[PDB]
Write a protein that binds this ligand. Structure first.
Ligand SMILES: [Fe+3]
Ligand SMILES: [Fe+3]
Ligand SMILES: [Fe+3]
Ligand SMILES: [Fe+3]
Lengths: 170, 170, 170, 170
């Protein structure tokens, strides 16, 4: 095994590799949304900037797991990054609802990884998940929930409320 | 012929004079729109500013073509500048739709000039068109398309949406 | 079609989408290399930094193609990003040789795109390829070729020469 | 008991005292290494500086545990600090291999402390271990592992490679 490996279970190593792929997939989804909202027949630049930033954040989360794998003496295994199943994202609200679902999907998998780390008595990994992932994930979910509520107030259908809400994201 | 002339076809010289007139005409159209939107019974200061700037840009494009004609040793021939097609431009959306049509008419004419320069093996002129005209033309068309989409979302009829959209242009 | 689409052939639209996928794949390959060179049993921080930067460059090339598709009125269709061919890249020289072959594969694909654009008389797209892709591609291939020659001089096998060469990349 | 003591198990108090002694011992080992590498017949100033800093870090880790014992209402009991196992540490690689083994011994002891704290439901102490000890310990082990790999590449025997590697630590 690696000269550095200590108290690092194979199940945690394997789960971290799966989580890297999920972070990269979420990155890919947000990239798709970011460019969709720059279509000339969509033209929502506030939503575009919001999802560009979200895509960068997910990519950095993925890289932090890659750095972590190396720190612990595990071996990174990268797999194909699936395209989003559905790339016509609809209105701003429909994309925000899709982002909320994805954030909770990622959160569920991070909590499952935490429960693998806990069961294997790996406090270095539970600390990583708590400090570097679970905190930002709860904040991200609350932010998107807020946004969905504000947009439902402004008016979620194609119309003036959506035009106005988009400006607050710029 | 001019002491500087080299590889400059008379068809390209003639087409440059045509484009100078077209740019000056587009300048004139946007000037008409600019002051239409400063009428007391129209009063759309963002649209007025957008079209004032558009009118200056077209004028500078025409002067760059005049400078180019002299650079290559062609002879500038100025013609009458036609009156704008309209004296009243309608709503903001109707003016943007006329501007989109006009921008696409100019683009077609520039692409036709590129074809003439290419058929006459004039790479100095194809470089001029690609770098100084065709690039800005696609960006301008994309911007106006975005604007039309944004205005249709806010509410394209005379109303609060048009009043609010106008502020983003100011 | 899009309100902005003009002189944009369906074959160039489709080839742009393929190239977006290829640029994202190359980004993924360099990301794999970057973190491989941070393994505790590899520990080549100069190579790691070099491929991290290359990975960012390829992602930005992909995003520029996505912006371009929207500028022309095309539709971005994202496809799955294949996993890198290798998880272990070998010596520094072997990774550089793999990078050179990939850079030449991408360059061949860009040149085929240019030929498609030229045959369809699309000078806006030929200008894009020449200015934003083909120029950097030749410079990248020349830089990697230089690096391979330098590393062959320093000593390309695992040893003091590779250790010293790695420092010039840091 | 102390007026401040709350949820502080006698077994964790005793284990803190043992760990203070272990951190002081590791500080002593690195101090021995530091001045060994300043012998006129060794003369490795980069290795000397590296272990001087490691010796200071371990003393600060011990002092933080002493502060902690007082914070919780425990009683510091200091024990004799054993002399280092070796007075002569050999080559740079041999000292690094001894440092890696010591870092992993300390890490194992910290993980056992964490398990004691967890079994006694002491989250203030598990947080201390995770944030102030286990994180730096993994980073130190990864850094030393990197150094061993780099030195094996440069050439770990007495020779030009060791001379060059020593410079990267200075
Ligand atoms: Fe994430
Ligand atoms: Fe113009
Ligand atoms: Fe590229
Ligand atoms: Fe310590």
């Amino acid at each position: 095994a690696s000269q550095v490996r200590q108290n690092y279970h194979e199940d945690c190593e394997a789960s971290i590799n799966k989580q890297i792929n999920m972070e990269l997939y979420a990155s890919y989804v947000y990239l798709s949304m970011a460019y969709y909202f720059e279509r000339d027949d969509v033209a929502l630049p506030g939503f575009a900037k919001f999802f560009k930033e979200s895509s960068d954040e997910e990519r950095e989360h993925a890289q932090t797991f890659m750095k972590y794998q190396n720190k612990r003496g595990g071996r990174i295994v990268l797999q194909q990054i699936a395209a989003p199943s559905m790339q016509e994202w609809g209105t701003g609200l429909e994309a925000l609802q899709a982002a909320l679902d994805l954030e909770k999907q990622v959160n569920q998998s991070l909590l499952e990884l935490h429960s693998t780390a806990s069961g294997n008595n790996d406090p270095h990994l539970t600390k990583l998940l708590e400090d570097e992932y679970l905190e930002e994930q709860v904040d991200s979910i609350k932010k998107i929930g807020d946004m969905i509520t504000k947009l439902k107030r402004a008016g979620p259908h194609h119309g003036l409320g959506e035009y106005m809400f988009d400006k607050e994201l710029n």
